[PDB]
Structures are given as C-alpha cells and as structure tokens.
Amino acid sequence: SARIMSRIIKITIIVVLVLLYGEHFGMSLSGLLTFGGIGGLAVGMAGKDILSNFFSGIMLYFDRPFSIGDWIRSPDRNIEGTVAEIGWRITKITTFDNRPLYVPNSLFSSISVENPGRMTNRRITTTIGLRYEDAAKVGVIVEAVREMLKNHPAIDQRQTLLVYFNQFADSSLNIMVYCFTKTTVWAEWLAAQQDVYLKIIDIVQSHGADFAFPSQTLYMD
Amino acid sequence: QFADSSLNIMVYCFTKTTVWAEWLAAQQDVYLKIIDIVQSHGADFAFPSQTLYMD
Amino acid sequence: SARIMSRIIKITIIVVLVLLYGEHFGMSLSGLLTFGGIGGLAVGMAGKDILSNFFSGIMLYFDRPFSIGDWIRSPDRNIEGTVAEIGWRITKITTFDNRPLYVPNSLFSSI
Ligand SMILES: CCCCCCCCCCCC
Ligand SMILES: CCCCCCCCCCCC
Ligand SMILES: CCCCCCCCCCCC
Ligand SMILES: CCCCCCCCCCCC
Ligand SMILES: CCCCCCCCCCCC
Ligand SMILES: CCCCCCCCCCCC
Ligand SMILES: CCCCCCCCCCCC
Ligand SMILES: CCCCCCCCCCCC
Ligand SMILES: CCCCCCCCCCCC
Ligand SMILES: CCCCCCCCCCCC
16 A cells, blocks of 8 residues: 555656646646646645644644643534544544544634633532422421531532522422532542532431432322 | 313512522522412322223 | 744745745745645635634624623523633633633624
C-alpha cells in the first residue's frame, strides 16, 4: 500500500509538472484539466476539507475550551470522554469504556461544549417519598434533614441547599434534596452521597415515618 | 376534569417573591394547608384504583 | 505548542509578504495562491466564521437579551444556566451542576 501510494503521488506530481509546463516543454494540457472543471473541483474540495479541519484546530488551540486529560461532552452531539490528544486534523477522545474515539476538528466548530473536568462542585439530588398517612410529620422530617445537611463536614455551606416538601405524587408525598459537596473527586463524592443517604434513612425511620411503595386501591367483586 | 380513578381539581396562583427558597417554603405551606383542608372536610386523596373480577 | 504556533504564524506572514511583493521583489506567486482558489477559500471561510461570531456578539450587546449573572434558557436548543461572561467570540454559561458551558456567539443569532 505504501509503495502504491508513493507511485500515485509521483504520478500526480508528473501530471502537475506537465500542466505547469507550457508549449516549450511538450503541451500544457490546461484545457484537458479544465475540460469540465475536473481539476478545479478536485483542488477545491480537498482544499476546503483540509483548511476547515486545520482552522478548526487552530481555533481550538486559541479559545481553549478544553485541554488534554479533560472530561468533556456536548448537548448537541455525543463526544463524551477524556481528551487524549489534539492533532492538527483529528482529536482523539478516550471514552469511559476505554475505547478510542476519533472526532474531526471541524465538528467542534458550531456546538456547545461542556467541560465537567473544570467543575467546581459535585451536586447531590434525591427525592424522599413518604406515605400519605405520614403527612403530620413532614415538617419535622424536613427540618431534621435540613439540620443534618447543615452540619455535614462534606457539604459546601456556600452553595445551594434546599430541603422542602415539593409535590404530590401518585402514591407518596415527595421531598426534594438539593446540595453540593466540597470535593470534586469521584470516589469521595460517592462516599459522601452514600453517607448522606444512610443518615436520611435513619432520620426517616427514627421519626416514625416510612418510605412508600407503589400503592393501589382494589375493589373486589 | 374526570380522571381514571379520581376527580381532579386544578390550583393556579402566583407568589409575590421571586426567591427560590422563599417560593419553595410558600409552596410547602400551601400544600400542607390544602392537605389539612381536604382531611377536615371528610374527603381523601385517591390512590390508583382498579376493579377486579375474580374467577 | 506556543513556539510552534509562533513559527507557523511567521511562516504565514512570510508567505503573505511574498504574495504582496511583485516582480521587483522575487516573484509574486499570485497564480500559485490562486491556482484553484486555495487562498480564496482559506481567507473566506476563516473570515466568515470570525465575522459571524463577532457580529453576533455585537448584536447581543446592543439588544441586551441577557446580562451577566442572568438565568437563561431556550426552547430551541438547551443553553440553560447562569451567564458568567460574554466574550467577543464565546459566551460562557455556568450550568446548575457548576460546570462551564461554552456557547459560540453565533448560536444566539436565530433562536
Ligand atoms: C498503480 C496505478 C496507480 C494509478 C494512480 C492514478 C492517480 C490519478 C490521480 C488523479 C487526480 C485528479
Ligand atoms: C481562523 C478561524 C477558523 C474557522 C474555521 C471554521 C471551519 C468551519 C467548518 C464547518 C464544516 C461544516
Ligand atoms: C488567527 C486568529 C487569531 C485570533 C486570536 C484570538 C485570541 C483570543 C485570546 C482571548 C484571551 C482571553
Ligand atoms: C493546503 C494547506 C495545508 C496546510 C497544512 C498545515 C499543516 C501544519 C502541521 C503542523 C505540525 C503539527
Ligand atoms: C497537503 C498538505 C499536507 C500537510 C501535512 C502536515 C502533517 C503534519 C504532521 C504533524 C505531526 C505532529
Ligand atoms: C514546524 C512546521 C510548521 C509549518 C506550518 C505551515 C503553515 C502553513 C499555513 C498555510 C495557510 C494557507
Ligand atoms: C450587525 C449585525 C450582525 C448580525 C450577525 C449575524 C450572524 C449570523 C451567523 C449565522 C451562522 C449560522
Ligand atoms: C451596528 C448596528 C447598531 C444598531 C443599534 C441599535 C440600537 C437599538 C436600541 C434599542 C433601545 C430600545
Ligand atoms: C477580520 C476581522 C477581525 C475583527 C476582530 C475584532 C476584535 C475586537 C476585540 C475587542 C476587545 C474585546
Ligand atoms: C484576526 C483578528 C484577531 C482579533 C483578536 C482580538 C482579540 C481580542 C481579545 C479581547 C480580550 C478582552
């Protein structure tokens, strides 16, 4: 394949040399190349593709939406993964399956790029579904959960922190939980989330309420 | 409107404040008051119902 | 990378200087650059992109759909978050996950 490609390259070089030469050296053959714009189209499409990719790479370098080793994604098209290398033509992304993903540079031209690798906090969200018969303790449970969250060493007190009775559900009364953690590490965030969930379970059990299963009323006949 | 297993009543209003926490607190208070009213008037909230013909 | 980019920039500068110069200074080489419109396309696409983004930013400044620190969204495409900065080319939006979101200015043109 390499030798065939070299042969074709030198054939193209000979063709271009013949085209450059005028009547003094053989015949220019300009009309043949411009017989129907074949040479024009051949040059134009290749140049357009190469220049588009090259300029997209240059703009990527100048704007700096992401760097090597950054976790990125896009709501427009999926490119999720960790950046491995930014070439002049193709950007290599390592997916979370440990598989290469080759993205042409021009695909970044007009899309919104998210950079989770540059996040400042990790969010924790969950819903507590209590039974409809536990409506008398909703306020106390919410207050207890908020107090527990406000005293947790792993929670960031400068970020949003909401715990309120949110909405009626089909078979439960839902309570929203919304907070952030100081750390941005995967394992530490997961451990903090697990600890918070266990504490929430303990609080709910201690206050006399319980979690609601999908309920249903049956009329027998 | 009539539902599959309940009679639905719509609630539609606005709050003076535009703050997230204050709006959520007002919503929770309104929901608790609605629950109290419904319980006091003798009605109750409907679970997904179903009629079963045994054989 | 910075030094390589500088080298390529000065190479392009030398190329443009050679193109500007006529027969008095070497050869203009205009035909080579216009052999198949390579230079024309290279200038046109870059200029179109840069000008589109710049003019979108200018229109954003003049119309004032939003300001710094404003929660925004769009039913057409998702950009939800709080505006962090409005640059000449890219607008930075902080999502509710506390992650940066870089939106080219031209994406606000028709939505
Ligand atoms: C082994 C034969 C190789 C022949 C390659 C021909 C290449 C033609 C290029 C035409 C470009 C317009
Ligand atoms: C110097 C600025 C370069 C801008 C490059 C834009 C490339 C757009 C390609 C779009 C292909 C669909
Ligand atoms: C070839 C075009 C070069 C454009 C360079 C733009 C540099 C932007 C720097 C922004 C720093 C905040
Ligand atoms: C037709 C224009 C081709 C331009 C190719 C430029 C390649 C630059 C590579 C820089 C080394 C990574
Ligand atoms: C038609 C022009 C082709 C230019 C090829 C550039 C190759 C650059 C390789 C950079 C490796 C780091
Ligand atoms: C280290 C080698 C760098 C070579 C850079 C070549 C840049 C070519 C620009 C062509 C623009 C049409
Ligand atoms: C002074 C008015 C500037 C208007 C800029 C419009 C840019 C449109 C870009 C569309 C790209 C798809
Ligand atoms: C370059 C074009 C400038 C257009 C300026 C429009 C100003 C609109 C002001 C509207 C105020 C209500
Ligand atoms: C080819 C036209 C380029 C125009 C670039 C204008 C850049 C203005 C920046 C203003 C400072 C924030
Ligand atoms: C090709 C023209 C490039 C113009 C680059 C403008 C850079 C403006 C930076 C403004 C920072 C506040």
